[PDB]
Design a protein around this nucleic acid. Structure first.
Lengths: 212, 216, 216, 212
DNA sequence: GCACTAGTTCGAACTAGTGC
DNA sequence: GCACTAGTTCGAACTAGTGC
């Protein structure tokens, strides 16, 4: 439900902010944790607020969706040079372990709760912050209905970096905002998928080699 | 769904072995340690490996607002028949009086590390788990989940029942289509499952205390 | 879910009025005729229009293979308490002996017409519906649905309960959040719902006869 | 999950036949009724067997999907002339009532079943058969979760009209077949949507006027 | 606000495909 | 064939948007 385009020499994405889903939701960040927010009820003050986007690179087996759509448009308009794709391919070739390798572990402690021993389940999370304010997250979740893991990639875009400014008001009905996607972001998201798992890497490599 | 009955002086539960769901599924817990791993095995071994298989049951005490379901039906039947005594219930009410802190109070924390994965900073999200093991091999566990639409945590209680503890014996056997097995519920398991709910959250404790008071 | 109980000499069912589902929902049946139409009205009128509103309940007699659910719980409680007499049950068993044809036997037919809609030939698919009305206004209906994965038909039994027949009176009232209303189940309704299942399919009849035999 | 393309001067669709869904399923036809079939278990003999395709013309608000994709490709390659689009627009302008207008009615009868009165619920169905063997169906279903109706358009494509011939064998795993879409079919499907309802018509009209 | 319509998440139940 | 993985339909429960 995201809309990717090329406008004014810039890759832009238009994102809805009032219909929260697994894929797109506005969050308030406190101590790392992302509190959900309803953008229609409470008014905005702002550095605390992000669009949380679980971004994809394929759909129906097609690599012309969200991230891959942004990349194709960038490469065709010289935002993403052949040089950039080469080094991302080099990065990928150098990557030998993944977030999925780390897995999820259960550790004993020396604590009890009224006679019950306390253990801690430890989930790995990979994160990078761009100087522009965007966050990239890679979370490991226990694969639904199946053994093993799924790695999920998120981009977190501060409300201060979108237009129009939501400052001082509730979102309008079906409000959609526009975000100019910086080349750095596309690079780092491709890198995130590369390290998320070997199967995500193999996909990204085939796609970028596809851009030739 | 499980089916709970009173038979021959015991509380008995009949459990599906083959149609795994979030409520009831066979899981592998290797040497009784680690996160339970899901499985769809229908043929069970007859050596040391059998002891790694459990029925994992995310067990409840109410359904549709009524307390005649799974654990509450076990307990009401156990007390009706003198399996769970008045004294047993008074001891559990006393335990609940003493509990003033809960698994949900611990919540979930994110820890920074010093590792980087190819330039990306690594953090660790840390979930508290409460767990107790009975002498006969059953595990009672309490874990947390983020609430679906809210800012809080939901606590869930599980009992993990060794396949070596059910009938007909699964050792070296392949489960039939829609196989259901029979498990005699030990009184101490009912006690510990009540205690699990009592320490899971204040709301769960309040529910359990009102329920126990009502069966007296 | 409905909640069925014995109170003050009557079988009583408590029914949700506000969270419509395929099982239980408020529907408008204008002057008691036509296909029921779904609605999410929370404010109910106090004139002739009130009589067009019903609670439509797709009612069952078993859940999880057990016969202690909705209609079977009504009937077992009714018989325990002498509301539904032995003689009543013998009359229903006699009725079932006489039934040798079922709504499912009728099936669904496609009829050709002579109409065309801008060049396209018009056909009509025709579904049989069995329906009975009680003197106090309740409807008992039986309809067919194509089976989800099979070549057959599934029969479903519905009771449509006038809102004017429940408590607290809904006339000129707005339903509260998660409102539940109270309905006293007439013995003749229990009889006719059993008869409905008996004529719906041979399988349903067999189920009902075995159930009735078991409560004797 | 259908794949539309332009090959050899013909619009072709590639359809899977072993993963039956609401949208695509293989059926055996007897006395009008469409029996479902599992193409992997039982071997094929053949005029009795059709691919039943609940075809669409939009997706995510985009009119580049299934039917609309076929039409766009046809018009761009001269299979569907401007003349064809004009007359389809004329057809549409002439259409003043719809399948949805007919609704679904409950009729009394003089029959009883062991004391219960029998009524008949009557559902309208629109159908056309091409000389090539394809059927087009419009069925009225009681709109899920809502008042009123939904009209659904189906194309039924005989297995004798696809390649390869399934004669004498079970389908292979993930077997997909290719069907060359005749211009007549695209015309008649557009006509089906036009008469299905006024809202389907308004959509189709805006789309064809969009092709200009 | 009422009375919807439409969009979503979640779990149960089912089926086809995959690798050993 | 076993032991999964992945694709689907269906209903319950919830939320945002719409027209009056």
């Amino acid at each position: 439900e995201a809309s990717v385009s090329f406008e004014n020499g810039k890759i832009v994405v238009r994102l809805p902010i009032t219909r929260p889903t697994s894929k797109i939701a506005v969050k308030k960040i406190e101590n790392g944790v992302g509190i959900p927010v309803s953008t229609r009820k409470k008014s905005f003050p702002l550095r605390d607020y992000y669009i949380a986007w679980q971004i994809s690179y394929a759909r129906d087996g097609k690599y012309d969706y969200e991230l891959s759509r942004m990349v194709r448009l960038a490469h065709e308009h010289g935002i993403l040079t052949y040089n950039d794709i080469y080094e991302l391919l080099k990065f990928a070739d150098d990557v030998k372990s993944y977030l999925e390798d780390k897995g999820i572990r259960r550790e004993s402690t020396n604590e009890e709760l009224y006679g019950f021993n306390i253990y801690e389940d430890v989930y790995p999370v990979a994160k990078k912050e761009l100087p522009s304010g965007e966050f990239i997250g890679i979370v490991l979740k226990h694969k639904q209905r199946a053994v093993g893991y799924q790695s999920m990639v998120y981009v977190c875009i501060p409300l201060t970096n979108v237009e129009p400014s939501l400052a001082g008001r509730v979102a309008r009905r079906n409000e959609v905002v526009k975000y100019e996607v910086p080349v750095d972001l596309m690079k780092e998201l491709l890198k995130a998928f590369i390290i998320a798992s070997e199967t995500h890497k193999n996909d990204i490599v085939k796609f970028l080699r596809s851009i030739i």
